[PDB]
C-alpha cells in the first residue's frame, strides 16, 4: 500500500497555478485567459518544457508573458500597464504554503506501515528568491519516502510515461497506490492505469474519502508530536577543545548559532524534539553531548568537570568553530552551565535560556555541601559524591536505569529521598521497570548503548565540584546577567520546583519567563510542543534582533 | 623569549581608552575631565572593579555617568544635554580595529620561536553590541599563545599580582620576555620585575625597538600568507548520504553557507588558506571531503562518481544539514560539480564559483571520449580510464605523487603529454621530486597521510564517466545559469586554461570573472592571497544581498 500526493493544491495551499484565475478576476481579464497563456501550446508549450526541468523559471517568465500578449490579443482585451508575470508569481509562491492537515495524513499513513511519496509537476527555481520554495520543499522531502519532481526526472503530468516510472520507483502495481491530485487531468492517467485515485477540491472531503479508502483514521486525529530525529540521519560533528577532550554534537538548520545543553544523564538526544523544531524556525542548532557523555571524551578526573572548565571548555569549542557568539539553551546540569556562561562570558553568549534549573547566586557563607542538606530532594546529590557508589548501580543495568528515570510527573518508580539511607537509588525499585509514555523502548535503547561507551563516571562528576563551583560562582556576586535571557520552568518538577525561580528577576533584571503545566523534571520529552513553542517565541523575539 | 602585547593601543588601534580625550576636547570640555571620571576612586574605583570582573560594562557605565557628573561638578563645568557615556564607549569599541603591522609583528615574533600573549585590562562585555568586540578578541586569540584578560583572572594592571601571574602562565622569568604598552603606569612594574618593557606611542617606533631588542625584523618585512589551518584544530563533520556513504567536511565561521569543492587528487586541506579567510569574512565555511577522498567514502564502483550521484549526494548533504541553500565554490573536478548544481539545482545554490574549470555545455554531438583526444593536454586523462593503472602508480610512493604535482606554474617536472604513450605520468621524472615552493613537506605529508585511506581508485573513478556525464549534462542544454556566479581564471594553468572559459556568458549572462597572474592549476595554494581577495569580493556582494 502506498499514497502518492500532488504538491500544488494538495500538500501545498493555496495552489500556485491557482493564482491564474485570482489574477484574471482582480484585473477584470476574460476568464482562463491566463491558464491559455498558460498551456499555450500544450506538449511543445513554453510551460511544459519548464516541467520538464528543459528550461529554468527565469526563462519561463519571458515566454509566458508573450503567451499573455498573444492570448489577449486573440481575446481582443490588453493588459495593465505594468503586468508583471515574475511579480504574480512571486507572490504566488511565496504566498503559498503547506496544508497541514494533508501533510499530517501522509505523515500518518506512513507512521502505519505506508510507502509515501510526493509526484508533482515542478519546475528548476532560479528566481533571486528560490529560497522560500527550497525550504518548503525541504520541510516536505523529510516526510516522504519519496519526492519525484518533473523537472528533475524529465517527465511530466498526464504522460503515461511519469505514471510508470512512479509505480517503478514506488516498487508497488497500482490498485496498491492511492493517488490525491487537485487536477482530474493529471489523476485520470493514475486511474486508467488502476490505481486509487482522489480529486482533491477541499481537503477534508479528500481526506474523508481517503481516510474510507485506507480504512486508517486521518482526520479529527489527536496531534502528532513534533519531528524527532533518528541519530544516522544527523550530522556530526566533533571538536577537540583540548589535547585530549573531543567534544560530540549534532548540527542542523542555519541562522544564529543556538547551542543546546543537557543535563545528567543524558545526551544531545534529549532534545531530538526540538533539533528538528528551532532548525525549521531558522536556527542553526547545535545540540551538544556535554563532557563526559556519548562521543564527547570523557576524562576521569573530577574537577575537569568543574562549571570553570566545563565554561572554559565551551568557550574554546565557539573558538574552535569559528563562532563568536551563540545563544545557550540549557537543561538541569546544562541549564546550570549556561547561566553562568551568562555570568562569566557575555559576549560569547547571545542569549541564555533555561528548563527548569534557576539562577540562585552562590552564598558567600554558608558552603555548597550544607545548603544541600536543607533539602531532603537533594539527598540523591550527597549519594553522588563518593566515587565509585553510584557509578556502581547506576551502570549494573543500564536500561533499568533509564526506563527508572525517564518518567513523567505522575509514573515515577523511585523513592527521590531517604536515598543514601537506602543505601541505593533503586532500592525499593523494580528491576522490571514500567515504560514511560514519554520513550518508546528504542528510545531508551539510545541511551543505553550512548552510556555504555564511558559510564556515569563522567556525569557523575559534574556533581562533584560543588565546593569549587562555590568558589568560582562567588567571583560573580556583583554581577547581573543582562544579555536576553530565559527561565522555563516545570510546574511539576519535584526537585528543580518553580519556586526556586522567583529571585531571579534581582539578578536578571530583563529575565523573561516560560512555564509548562503538569510537566516533570525531564522537559524536553515530556512536553516537547509547549517547549519548542516557548524557546521559539523567545529566540525570535530576544536572540535574533 | 616571550613577548606580551597589551591590546588597548597596541594591538587595537585606535585605543578606546583613548576616546575620553577626543570627547572632552569635541565637547570644550576641562582637559583630562573625562580621564578623572574614568580613574575616579583609584584600585577602589568603579571601574577597577570592571577592570577586575567585579560587575559588568552595562553595570559600570551608570557609574561612570555619576563620576563624569561629580568630575564635572568639581571643576565648575557642565555636560551637554544629552551626553551619553555608552554612546561613546560603543562609538569608541567599533571604531577600534587590529593594529595589522603589530599583529603581524606578533606573528612573527611566534614563528620564530617565541611564546606570545596578550595581557590586557578588559571588561566583561554584556552590551547588545558586545558581539563586535567578541569577533576582535576572537580573531587576535588564535594568533598568540595566551590571552590574560583582567576581568578574568581578578587582577588588573598595575597592580603587581598580575605580572607575577604572567611570568607564571607564561614559564618564563624576566630578562627574557618582552613587554609593550601603551600606557607607562602599567609599563613600570614589569619593568622593576627585570623584563625589557616597551613603551608605545607610535607603532613604527615601537616596532624598531622590538625588532631592535629581539634582534628579529619585523618591520618592511615581505607579506605573511594569509591564516592557514592546523587540520586538529578544525571542527570535523560527518553526513551519511547514503547506507555506506559518508562524507566530512571542515566546517568554520558563521554566516551564509558557503560550500567548498576541492579537485583531483586533494582534499578539504587544499582550502587550508580561504577557510580561515572566507570564515573571518562572515560566512560559515564547510570545505569538503568529496566523495572519494580523506574522510569521506570512497566506495569501488565507477558510476558512484557521476557527477548525477554527486550532486544528487550534495543535495542530500545540505538536506541532512538543514541546510535549504550554500554558495557553491570548486576547483577542478569540484568546479565542474559545481556548474551542474547550479544547472541541476538552482534552489539549492545560492550561488556558484569556480576556480579555473570553465562552464562548456555538452555537445550533442561529438561523445566526450573524443572531445578529450583532440587536444594533447588532456591525454593524462585517457590514461585514467583504464581501472587499475593510474592507481598502480599514484599510489606506489604517495610523497612522490603530491610533490610532483603540487607545483608552480614553472618548477613543472612532468611531461604533461604524450603520457599513455610515455607509459606513466611519471616516466622521466625524479624519484626524489624537489619541493615546491608552495608546500612545505609537512603540508605534503598531510596529503599523504589522507591519501593512505582510500588511494586514488574513487579519486580516479570521477573521470570515469564522462560518457555518462555527458548524456546527463545534455539534459541541460536549453538552460541558462542565472543565479549569482563567478568564473576565476588562472593565466598559467596550462591544461584548464583562461582561454576556455571565453563563451561563459552565453550561458551565465551575468557571470562576474577573476583572474590571476603567474597562478598555476593549484590556485589556492599558489595564490591564496589574491584568490581569497577575489572570492570575498564576490561573496560580499552577490551570496550574501
Same mark, same amino acid.
Given at each position: 500500500?502506498?499514497?502518492?500526493?500532488?504538491?500544488?493544491?494538495?500538500?501545498?495551499? %493555496?495552489?500556485?497555478?491557482?493564482?491564474?484565475?485570482?489574477?484574471?478576476?482582480?484585473?477584470?481579464?476574460?476568464?482562463?485567459?491566463?491558464?491559455?497563456?498558460?498551456?499555450?501550446?500544450?506538449?511543445?508549450?513554453?510551460?511544459?518544457?519548464?516541467?520538464?526541468?528543459?528550461?529554468?523559471?527565469?526563462?519561463?517568465?519571458?515566454?509566458?508573458?508573450?503567451?499573455?500578449?498573444? *492570448?489577449?490579443?486573440?481575446?481582443?482585451?490588453?493588459?495593465?500597464?505594468?503586468?508583471?508575470?515574475?511579480?504574480?508569481? /512571486?507572490?504566488?509562491?511565496?504566498?503559498?504554503?503547506?496544508?497541514?492537515?494533508?501533510?499530517?495524513?501522509?505523515?500518518?499513513?506512513?507512521?502505519?506501515?505506508?510507502?509515501?511519496?510526493?509526484? +508533482?509537476?515542478?519546475?528548476?527555481?532560479?528566481?533571486?528568491?528560490?529560497?522560500?520554495?527550497?525550504?518548503?520543499?525541504?520541510?516536505?522531502?523529510?516526510?516522504?519516502?519519496?519526492?519525484?519532481?518533473?523537472?528533475?526526472?524529465?517527465?511530466?503530468?498526464?504522460?503515461?510515461?511519469?505514471?510508470?516510472?512512479? $509505480?517503478?520507483?514506488?516498487?508497488?502495481? &497500482?490498485?496498491?497506490?492511492?493517488?490525491?491530485?487537485?487536477?482530474?487531468?493529471?489523476?485520470?492517467?493514475?486511474?486508467?492505469?488502476?490505481?486509487?485515485?482522489?480529486?482533491?477540491?477541499?481537503?477534508?472531503?479528500?481526506?474523508?474519502?481517503?481516510?474510507?479508502?485506507?480504512?486508517?483514521?486521518?482526520?479529527? +486525529?489527536?496531534?502528532?508530536?513534533?519531528?524527532?530525529?533518528?541519530?544516522?540521519?544527523?550530522?556530526?560533528?566533533?571538536?577537540?577543545?583540548?589535547?585530549?577532550?573531543?567534544?560530540?554534537?549534532?548540527?542542523?538548520?542555519?541562522?544564529?548559532?543556538?547551542?543546546?545543553?543537557?543535563?545528567?544523564?543524558?545526551?544531545?538526544?534529549?532534545?531530538?524534539?526540538?533539533?528538528?523544531?528551532?532548525?525549521?524556525?531558522?536556527?542553526?542548532?547545535?545540540?551538544? @553531548?556535554?563532557?563526559?557523555?556519548?562521543?564527547?571524551?570523557?576524562?576521569?578526573?573530577?574537577?575537569?568537570?568543574?562549571?570553570?572548565?566545563?565554561?572554559?571548555?565551551?568557550?574554546?569549542?565557539? @573558538?574552535? $568553530?569559528?563562532?563568536?557568539?551563540?545563544?545557550?539553551?540549557?537543561?538541569?546540569?546544562?541549564?546550570?552551565?549556561?547561566?553562568?556562561?551568562?555570568?562569566?562570558?557575555?559576549?560569547?553568549?547571545?542569549?541564555?535560556?533555561?528548563?527548569?534549573?534557576?539562577?540562585?547566586?552562590?552564598?558567600?557563607?554558608?558552603?555548597?555541601?550544607?545548603?544541600?542538606?536543607?533539602? &531532603?530532594?537533594?539527598?540523591?546529590?550527597?549519594?553522588?559524591?563518593?566515587?565509585?557508589?553510584?557509578?556502581?548501580?547506576?551502570?549494573?543495568?543500564?536500561?533499568?536505569?533509564?526506563?527508572?528515570?525517564?518518567?513523567?510527573?505522575?509514573?515515577?518508580? $523511585?523513592?527521590?529521598?531517604?536515598?543514601?539511607?537506602?543505601?541505593?537509588?533503586?532500592?525499593?525499585?523494580?528491576?522490571?521497570?514500567?515504560?514511560?509514555?514519554?520513550?518508546?523502548?528504542?528510545?531508551?535503547?539510545?541511551?543505553?548503548?550512548?552510556?555504555?561507551?564511558?559510564?556515569?563516571?563522567?556525569?557523575?562528576?559534574?556533581?562533584?565540584?560543588?565546593?569549587?563551583?562555590?568558589?568560582?560562582?562567588?567571583?560573580?556576586?556583583?554581577?547581573?546577567?543582562?544579555?536576553?535571557?530565559?527561565?522555563?520552568?516545570?510546574?511539576?518538577?519535584?526537585?528543580?520546583? %518553580?519556586?526556586?525561580?522567583?529571585?531571579?528577576?534581582?539578578?536578571?533584571?530583563?529575565?523573561?519567563?516560560?512555564?509548562?503545566?503538569? *510537566?516533570?523534571?525531564?522537559?524536553?520529552?515530556?512536553? &516537547?510542543?509547549?517547549?519548542?513553542?516557548?524557546?521559539?517565541?523567545?529566540? /525570535?523575539? /530576544?536572540?535574533?534582533?
Amino acid at each position: 500500500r502506498a499514497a502518492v500526493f500532488d504538491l500544488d493544491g494538495v500538500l501545498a495551499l %493555496p495552489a500556485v497555478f491557482g493564482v491564474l484565475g485570482r489574477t484574471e478576476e482582480a484585473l477584470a481579464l476574460p476568464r482562463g485567459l491566463l491558464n491559455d497563456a498558460f498551456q499555450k501550446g500544450g506538449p511543445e508549450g513554453a510551460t511544459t518544457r519548464l516541467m520538464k526541468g528543459e528550461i529554468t523559471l527565469s526563462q519561463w517568465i519571458p515566454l509566458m508573458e508573450e503567451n499573455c500578449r498573444k *492570448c489577449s490579443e486573440t481575446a481582443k482585451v490588453c493588459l495593465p500597464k505594468n503586468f508583471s508575470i515574475k511579480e504574480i508569481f /512571486d507572490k504566488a509562491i511565496s504566498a503559498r504554503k503547506i496544508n497541514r492537515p494533508m501533510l499530517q495524513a501522509a505523515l500518518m499513513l506512513r507512521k502505519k506501515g505506508f510507502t509515501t511519496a510526493i509526484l +508533482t509537476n515542478t519546475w528548476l527555481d532560479d528566481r533571486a528568491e528560490r529560497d522560500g520554495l527550497a525550504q518548503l520543499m525541504c520541510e516536505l522531502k523529510m516526510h516522504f519516502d519519496f519526492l519525484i519532481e518533473s523537472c528533475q526526472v524529465g517527465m511530466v503530468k498526464p504522460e503515461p510515461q511519469i505514471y510508470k516510472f512512479l $509505480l517503478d520507483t514506488l516498487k508497488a502495481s &497500482p490498485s496498491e497506490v492511492v493517488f490525491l491530485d487537485d487536477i482530474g487531468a493529471n489523476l485520470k492517467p493514475a486511474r486508467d492505469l488502476g490505481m486509487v485515485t482522489i480529486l482533491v477540491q477541499d481537503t477534508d472531503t479528500a481526506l474523508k474519502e481517503l481516510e474510507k479508502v485506507t480504512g486508517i483514521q486521518l482526520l479529527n +486525529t489527536p496531534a502528532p508530536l513534533p519531528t524527532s530525529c533518528n541519530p544516522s540521519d544527523m550530522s556530526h560533528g566533533y571538536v577537540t577543545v583540548k589535547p585530549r577532550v573531543r567534544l560530540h554534537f549534532v548540527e542542523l538548520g542555519s541562522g544564529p548559532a543556538v547551542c543546546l545543553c543537557h543535563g545528567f544523564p543524558e545526551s544531545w538526544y534529549s532534545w531530538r524534539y526540538q533539533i528538528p523544531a528551532l532548525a525549521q524556525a531558522g536556527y542553526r542548532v547545535l545540540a551538544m @553531548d556535554m563532557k563526559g557523555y556519548g562521543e564527547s571524551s570523557a576524562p576521569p578526573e573530577i574537577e575537569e568537570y568543574c562549571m570553570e572548565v566545563l565554561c572554559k571548555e565551551m568557550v574554546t569549542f565557539l @573558538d574552535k $568553530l569559528g563562532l563568536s557568539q551563540a545563544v545557550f539553551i540549557g537543561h538541569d546540569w546544562g541549564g546550570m552551565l549556561v547561566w553562568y556562561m551568562a555570568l562569566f562570558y557575555p559576549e560569547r553568549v547571545r542569549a541564555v535560556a533555561s528548563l527548569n534549573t534557576p539562577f540562585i547566586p552562590a552564598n558567600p557563607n554558608m558552603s555548597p555541601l550544607e545548603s544541600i542538606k536543607a533539602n &531532603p530532594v537533594f539527598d540523591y546529590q550527597l549519594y553522588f559524591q563518593e566515587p565509585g557508589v553510584a557509578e556502581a548501580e547506576l551502570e549494573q543495568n543500564l536500561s533499568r536505569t533509564f526506563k527508572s528515570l525517564f518518567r513523567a510527573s505522575d509514573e515515577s518508580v $523511585l523513592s527521590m529521598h531517604k536515598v543514601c539511607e537506602a543505601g541505593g537509588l533503586f532500592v525499593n525499585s523494580p528491576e522490571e521497570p514500567s515504560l514511560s509514555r514519554m520513550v518508546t523502548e528504542e528510545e531508551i535503547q539510545f541511551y543505553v548503548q550512548q552510556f555504555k561507551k564511558s559510564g556515569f563516571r563522567g556525569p557523575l562528576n559534574w556533581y562533584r565540584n560543588m565546593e569549587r563551583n562555590w568558589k568560582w560562582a562567588c567571583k560573580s556576586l556583583g554581577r547581573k546577567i543582562l544579555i536576553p535571557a530565559l527561565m522555563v520552568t516545570a510546574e511539576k518538577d519535584f526537585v528543580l520546583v %518553580p519556586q526556586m525561580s522567583q529571585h531571579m528577576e534581582d539578578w536578571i533584571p530583563h529575565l523573561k519567563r516560560g512555564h509548562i503545566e503538569d *510537566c516533570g523534571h525531564w522537559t524536553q520529552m515530556d512536553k &516537547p510542543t509547549e517547549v519548542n513553542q516557548i524557546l521559539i517565541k523567545w529566540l /525570535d523575539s /530576544d536572540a535574533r534582533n
